């Protein structure tokens, strides 16, 4: 029974591999060769945000591209005014072992989580001025690697138990559990339309999920090591995935395949965090190399490098208006580059 | 206008920085210990604050969550076939890129030759502290196991981190953790000042 079924699975995998081959027409590495390169884009740190006492695992910009939240293992979420460097909030955590965070696009809530297997959502906007946890979205059976808000009442989380889940924040429950994967789920990126999201995992694969159903629409493979980070290309048809194999890979959802690898012979460091510029032309990826490369998303040229950190770069993201790149690191600083 | 908004934000910043500076004296003062073999345990020995993390809520896989324990003073590693698993875990931690600066306090609790044939040729290496009346075959086994862990610990790290094996009374065990942490901290400082 099992052998017949596993053989069927292999046949289906091969039919899919061939279906992908069937679409393996000229790709970006052949198509964009006649497109002027982005050149060498230098960025300088414009702002240094000091105050974390511990490594910073995650950040998320709100939609105003001014309020930035970052999470660190000193037990705090710090909401920074990225233009002035002033702290707005320094929110205590129930537990310091925090791996992720998210900022509601609205600025009303901030989320975080880690080894508690709880996504903790705070009310940033409250009459007392005291930021408190509104909900403890308990129920994961492993650590929270990543969370992202869809709305004030909806959050998608990724965890160490190999699943992702869409939570109803007010009722405090998973409404959709997105099962699949074999290893830990490491990263979420919501598509701009919040109908789709993509989830990276330690299976060296990423899945495109329909957030409205517990269904995987597409599985993307091509990685050889754990995926640590995903970001969508800003039109929702593609995403970049960072992994331990030091190759960031661009995938396209309609093509159902890898389009491009962003790698270099001199990089043997993994990718810990990825993001795109508003145009989708620049792909940024943070590494164990204590820097962030700014890849030409269409050509895979390396262009410039952001290298203000001494320790692992993680916690990378870009503002909604495309104005700035913020990176965190295990050195406990955020740096805003442009 | 916006000048009042800026004033207010600066005042808020000051309130926050002052609170973080207070918190900083607790954060740096309280030592973190990771326990292998999240449930936070807080304790104090001779007025030194420590807290230990029994990370028993994360399933079998360790690749990504042990990685978050990079600032830990020490990993408390508890042992007792199952030994090879403990040695392999110890080794992967020991050689982990992010845990390569963290010392390990090792607690060895509780036929060896069928799992470790080399044990048969093992001689208790002179320095031993058997209990009076303790069976020499047990003494031999305990030091053998201890040494296999040390063989791993002395293989790499270039002095960045050390293994502190102990055998196993919670009072004595916690006393050992304190003393091992004391040695861990002094060794870190001695290397910072290039005195070790």
């Amino acid at each position, epitope marked *: 029974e099992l052998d017949q079924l596993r053989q069927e699975a292999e046949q289906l995998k091969n039919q899919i*591999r061939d279906a992908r081959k069937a679409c393996a027409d000229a790709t970006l590495s052949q198509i964009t060769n006649n497109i002027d390169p982005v050149g060498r884009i230098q960025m300088r740190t414009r702002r240094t945000l000091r105050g974390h006492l511990a490594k910073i695992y995650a950040m998320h910009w709100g939609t105003d591209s001014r309020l930035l939240v970052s999470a660190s293992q000193d037990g705090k979420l710090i909401i920074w005014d990225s233009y002035t460097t002033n702290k707005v909030h320094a929110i205590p955590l129930r537990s310091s072992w925090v791996m992720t965070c998210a900022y509601a696009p609205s600025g009303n809530y901030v989320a975080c989580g880690g080894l508690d297997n709880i996504c903790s959502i705070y009310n940033l906007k409250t009459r007392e001025g005291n930021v408190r946890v509104s909900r403890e979205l308990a129920g994961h059976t492993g650590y929270l690697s990543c969370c992202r808000f869809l709305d004030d009442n909806q959050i998608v989380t990724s965890s160490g138990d190999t699943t992702c889940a869409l939570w109803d924040i007010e009722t405090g429950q998973q409404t959709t559990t997105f099962t699949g994967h074999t*290893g830990d789920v490491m990263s979420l990126s919501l598509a701009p339309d919040t109908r789709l999201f993509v989830s990276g995992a*330690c*299976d060296a694969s990423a899945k495109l999920w329909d957030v409205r159903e517990g269904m995987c629409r597409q599985t993307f493979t091509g990685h050889e090591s754990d995926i640590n980070a995903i970001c969508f290309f800003p039109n929702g048809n593609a995403f970049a995935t960072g992994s331990d*194999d030091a190759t960031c890979r661009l995938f396209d959802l309609r093509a159902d395949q890898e389009l491009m690898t962003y790698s270099h012979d001199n990089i043997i460091c993994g990718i810990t965090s990825v993001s795109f510029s508003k145009s989708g032309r620049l792909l940024l990826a943070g590494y164990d190399d204590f820097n962030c490369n700014v890849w030409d998303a269409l050509k895979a040229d390396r262009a410039g490098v952001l290298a203000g950190h001494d320790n692992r770069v993680s916690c990378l993201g870009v503002t909604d208006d495309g104005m700035a790149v913020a990176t965190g690191s295990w050195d406990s600083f955020l740096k805003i580059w442009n | 206008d916006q000048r009042n908004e800026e004033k207010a934000q600066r005042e808020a910043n000051k309130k926050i920085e002052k609170q973080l500076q207070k918190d900083k004296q607790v954060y740096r003062a309280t030592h973190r210990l990771l326990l292998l073999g999240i449930f936070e345990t807080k304790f104090q020995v001779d007025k030194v604050n420590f807290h230990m993390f029994d990370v028993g809520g994360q*399933r079998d896989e*360790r690749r990504k969550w*042990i990685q978050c324990f990079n600032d830990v003073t020490a990993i408390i590693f508890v042992v007792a076939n199952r030994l*090879q698993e403990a040695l392999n875990l110890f080794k992967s931690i020991w050689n982990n890129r992010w845990l390569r600066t963290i010392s390990v306090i090792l607690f060895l609790n509780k036929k060896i030759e069928d799992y470790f*044939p080399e044990f048969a040729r093992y001689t208790t290496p002179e320095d031993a502290t058997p209990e009076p009346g303790e069976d020499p075959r047990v003494t031999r086994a305990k030091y053998f196991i201890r040494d296999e862990f040390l063989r791993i610990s002395t293989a790499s790290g270039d002095g960045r981190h050390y293994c502190y094996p102990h055998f196993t009374v919670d009072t004595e065990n916690i006393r050992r953790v304190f003393n091992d942490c004391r040695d861990i901290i002094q060794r870190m400082h001695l290397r910072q000042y290039e005195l070790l």
Partner: nanobody, 126 residues
Framework: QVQLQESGGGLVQPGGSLRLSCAAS????????MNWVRQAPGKGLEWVSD????????SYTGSVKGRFTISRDNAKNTLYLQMNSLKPEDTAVYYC?????????????????????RGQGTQVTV
């Protein structure tokens, strides 16, 4: 996609030998440390052996030292486990497993029950 396929299992008369191979694909085999994992029936997953990226250092479970040996041919993306003088005690499913990251020394979660970078394995009986 990462793929590891073991072959060469079967029933081997006690005291005999068996050559178990693992065909690897997808990943750049030459950048990874590789292991073998064993599941005796009724047991969890035991680590059996560890061969370095370059095929240099090799480590073994003490229980198999001198009885099982390993090698890798990077040019063929193939890992091998040569089992000599097999005992009934060695009945197990043998699995090919890769160490998570390229260019490393650590092998976390090899022998984890859900480790992703592992093959289906072959049943070896004695």
């Amino acid at each position: 996609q990462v793929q590891l396929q073991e072959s060469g299992g079967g029933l081997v008369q006690p005291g005999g030998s068996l050559r178990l191979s693992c065909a690897a694909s997808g990943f750049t085999f030459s950048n990874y440390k590789m292991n073998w994992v064993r599941q005796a029936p009724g047991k969890g997953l035991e680590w059996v052996s560890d061969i370095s990226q370059s095929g240099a250092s090799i480590s073994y479970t003490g229980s198999v030292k001198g009885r099982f040996t390993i090698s890798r041919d990077n040019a063929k993306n193939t890992l091998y486990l040569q089992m000599n003088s097999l005992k009934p005690e060695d009945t197990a499913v043998y699995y090919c497993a890769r160490c998570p990251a390229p260019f490393t020394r650590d092998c976390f979660d090899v022998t984890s029950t859900t480790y992703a970078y592992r093959g289906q394995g072959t049943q070896v009986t004695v």
